[PDB]
Amino acid sequence: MLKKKQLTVLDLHPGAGKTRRVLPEIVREAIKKRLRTVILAPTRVVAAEMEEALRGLPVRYMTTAVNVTHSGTEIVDLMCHATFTSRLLQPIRVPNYNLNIMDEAHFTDPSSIAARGYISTRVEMGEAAAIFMTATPPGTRDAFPDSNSPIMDTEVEVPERAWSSGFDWVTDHSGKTVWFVPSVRNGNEIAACLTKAGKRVIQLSRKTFETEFQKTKNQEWDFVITTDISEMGANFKADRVIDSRRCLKPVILDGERVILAGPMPVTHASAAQRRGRIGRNPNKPGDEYMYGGGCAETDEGHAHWLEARMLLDNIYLQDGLIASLYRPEADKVAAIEGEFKLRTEQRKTFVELMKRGDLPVWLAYQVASAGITYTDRRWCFDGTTNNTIMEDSVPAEVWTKYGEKRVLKPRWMDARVCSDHAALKSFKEFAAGKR
């Protein structure tokens, strides 16, 4: 696997031991061969699990998620997928790693797709090796892969709203359930219903994931209500998954605005990863997978692959060359390669809007490419009337950094800045000049 120009898809089924058994063997071999190696974890939670899998191997944990004292001599680095792409974009030295290992390599956040594009391009140039670890490579059509123990698969109507009757099977269960919902707001409504029925519920989403995931270890629970973030190596002591089989798809309309379309069907890869939360213990056969819809290839025209092109157009590779998306997922976007390349100062603005600004990639790009500087928030208030953002059925208002109360009405409207209360609070802080 470790030879130059080799990209290996380590596609063992979910729970087959890719992270805990195979990865430490790869790392031992890499160190013996003096290969400068990077290991990419999708989340801080997985970074900390990897330290346990790799204990007593000389690895530099480029994350505050791991409490370790480095020797200073490590030739293996571990960081998050997002950290890798972030450091490529910034004026910071990133080693040309001989071996590039991506764990949970199916992750479809923009920074993960961009990282696969960069790594697979360096391999194709003949510079590097890569290992992509996932049960569900891009374009997999199998929602029901093999497991450590037999799963009971049942197609059934799954509630997506509060219910009073007609779903007794949901609450009659005495075990632990992981329930995948299409959005934070949908999970809130289902969580409230379950809580009202006397169940202990933990809610997970991207922003809350590290803090709330610890509650799955520290407290007794009946249900975990999660968005698709739990597709990325989240492990639970569960015996049932309830899967809406639904997700939100960010869609760019008319090059002008981003909407959160759907909910609509998940991909096969997503469904297999959701199911893959259970069936993991060979001594516990008959974990249950209840699924409420079919799969479709909803990644086609999904904004994350356009956003991945915005990131890759702004990463130095060699002279004016630009990394291609990883071939199996390259048809998910219609972009002109290089169309999003920014000059040095606009790139710096673009990076700062994503990092400190915490804006979606697409929205950061519209602002930076318009020649607006990071702290200039005039654009948050000068959009068209249909761009008015709502809070409790009235226009959302902030006090500007000038001390003027203004309606939130961004010149470029991205539905992800107000898809839930937390997002809207963050965007209101931004529009007010508070970060």
Ligand X SMILES: CCOc1ccccc1N1CCNCC1
Which residues fall in the annotated binding site for ATP? 12-19
- Shortest Å distance, C-beta 64 to ligand X: 4
- Look at residues 23, 123, 120 and name the one whose alpha carbon lies nearest to residue 330: 120
The piece of 57-65, 152-160, 170-178, 265-273 that touches ligand X (CB under 6 A) is 57-65
The piece of 45-53, 56-64, 284-292, 370-378 that touches ligand X (CB under 6 A) is 56-64
Q: Which residues contact 327 (CB under 8 A, 6 or more apart)?
A: 120
Among 3, 34, 56, 64, binds ligand X (CB under 6 A): 64
The piece of 55-63, 135-143, 211-219, 364-372 that touches ligand X (CB under 6 A) is 55-63
The piece of 60-68, 332-340, 387-395, 406-414 that touches ligand X (CB under 6 A) is 60-68
- Shortest Å distance, C-beta 377 to ligand X: 27
Q: Which is nearer to ligand X, 60 or 245 (CB)?
A: 60
Q: Which is nearer to ligand X, 64 or 283 (CB)?
A: 64
Among 19, 37, 63, 111, binds ligand X (CB under 6 A): 63
- Look at residues 416, 43, 359 and name the one whose alpha carbon lies nearest to residue 229: 43
- Shortest Å distance, C-beta 291 to ligand X: 39
In the window 1-20, what residues touch ligand X (CB under 6 A)? Answer: none
Question: Does residue 7 contact residue 123 with C-beta atoms inside 8 Å?
Answer: yes
- Shortest Å distance, C-beta 36 to ligand X: 14
Q: Which is nearer to ligand X, 45 or 322 (CB)?
A: 45
Q: Which is nearer to ligand X, 63 or 112 (CB)?
A: 63
Torsion of CA 363, 366, 369, 375, to 10 degrees: -60
- Look at residues 165, 178, 156 and name the one whose alpha carbon lies nearest to residue 242: 178
Q: Which is nearer to ligand X, 86 or 148 (CB)?
A: 86
Question: Does residue 271 contact residue 143 with C-beta atoms inside 8 Å?
Answer: yes
Q: Which is nearer to ligand X, 51 or 414 (CB)?
A: 51
Among 39, 40, 45, 62, binds ligand X (CB under 6 A): 62
- Shortest Å distance, C-beta 63 to ligand X: 5
- Decide if residue 73 touches ligand X (CB under 6 A): no
What is the CA angle 295-306-415, rounded to 5?
75
CA 238/CA 13 separation, integer angstroms: 18
- Shortest Å distance, C-beta 101 to ligand X: 17
**Binding residues for ligand X, total number by CB under 6 A:** 4
Chain position carrying tokens 């629970």: 221
Q: Report how far apart, in Å, the C-alpha atoms of 323 and of each of 61, 119, 218, 403, 408 are.
A: 26, 8, 43, 44, 37
- Shortest Å distance, C-beta 94 to ligand X: 11
Amino acid in the structure at residue 378: R
- Decide if residue 43 touches ligand X (CB under 6 A): no
What is the CA angle 5-11-17, rounded to 5?
115
- Shortest Å distance, C-beta 41 to ligand X: 12
Residue numbers in the known binding site are 12-19
Question: Does residue 308 contact residue 113 with C-beta atoms inside 8 Å?
Answer: yes
Q: Which is nearer to ligand X, 64 or 71 (CB)?
A: 64
Q: Which is nearer to ligand X, 60 or 406 (CB)?
A: 60
3-class secondary structure, 368: helix
| Chain length of the chain | 435
> Could you write out the DSSP letters of every residue in 201-259?
EEEE-TTTHHHHHHHHHHS--SEEEE-GGGGSS-----SEEEE--EEEEEEEETTTEEE
Residues that bind ligand X (CB under 6 A): 60, 62-64
